[PDB]
């Protein structure tokens, strides 16, 4: 609702200052492109953005952001690109990413190939390595795959 501000009073959250009518109105929630701005009567009319475009903060911009298209013939998505997020890539299934970047670490690395007699702590496939520590028999350990923990 177009609630009028008064001198020495701050407009509440989710309302900014709209200068076209000099009156603060409600802010559309993240996931919206303000297509009509505030007037003396008309509040901000919310409407969702298109695909592969978003806004991560309660916005009034008439244009939405842009996520990526694909990471590679490999490098599947570990996080989809919806209306409230970005296409967070990974460095292919069964490969650990040891470097870092905004999403795509410039260097990935093979998941691991450590011999029977190594126990892979945890992949940390997003930003870490599986590691390989002895567990030499463990319960049953006679496989070189290293994709699996000490199990048979």
């Amino acid at each position: 609702t177009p609630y009028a501000p008064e001198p020495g009073s701050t407009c509440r959250l989710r309302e900014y200052y709209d200068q076209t009518a000099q009156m603060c109105c409600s802010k559309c929630s993240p996931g919206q492109h303000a297509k009509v701005f505030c007037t003396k009567t008309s509040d901000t009319v919310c409407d969702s953005c298109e695909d592969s475009t978003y806004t991560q903060l309660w916005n009034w911009v008439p244009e939405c952001l842009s996520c990526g298209s694909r990471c590679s013939s490999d490098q599947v998505e570990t996080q989809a690109c919806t209306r409230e997020q970005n296409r967070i890539c990974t460095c292919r299934p069964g490969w650990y990413c040891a470097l870092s970047k905004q999403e795509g670490c410039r260097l990935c690395a093979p998941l691991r190939k450590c011999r029977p007699g190594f126990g892979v702590a945890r992949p940390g496939t997003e930003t870490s390595d599986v590691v390989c520590k002895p567990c030499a028999p463990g319960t049953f350990s006679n496989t070189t795959s290293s994709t699996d923990i000490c199990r048979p």
Partner: antibody
Amino acid sequence: EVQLQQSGAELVKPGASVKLSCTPSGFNIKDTYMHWVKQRPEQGLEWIGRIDPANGYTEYDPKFQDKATITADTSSNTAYLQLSSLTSEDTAVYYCADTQLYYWGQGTTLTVSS
Amino acid sequence: QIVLTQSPAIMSASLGERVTMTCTASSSVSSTYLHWYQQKPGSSPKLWIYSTSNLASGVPARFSGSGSGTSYSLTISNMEAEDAATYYCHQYHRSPLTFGAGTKLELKS
């Protein structure tokens, strides 16, 4: 032999503190991975958190990071979960857990008594 | 995110009846692996099933539990007396280690 021996029952009152000395044996000390586990009386198994004594890195669970304190020595074949602000609810038999083993010993009989 | 929640909480059965158990999970029963566990009253818990189908080395195989998907299972033919216990769902192959919440197998008489 592969076990988790620790300090015996200790009657520390609520609010007190005492270190709890895990004593790995039989297996190699290794000390890159070391977790602890505890269970309130007839509660569910709660995981205290893990640590990397050899590389000096700490990985506890988010829940108990407030109480997160443990050190170990590579030569002594011994691990030590420091613990602060003990409460009667923490009374349990604390097994000095770790991955690569997934086996627990007699448990540090905690004796927080009023 | 780490959540493990057991399914039917209390089992009370007589000698012979099979076993039905489950933990709802987010990421780890089918591809990413978990663990079965068992603790007798006031003692050290133990590992029964290891690769979601791989039972503990050198033990009777009555624990016919190999659930998958996002909700796994245990089943036991002719439930014994030792079989009466609590049981746990792990969530390994994840950054924070976590455990289950117990399933009390009361022995009906």
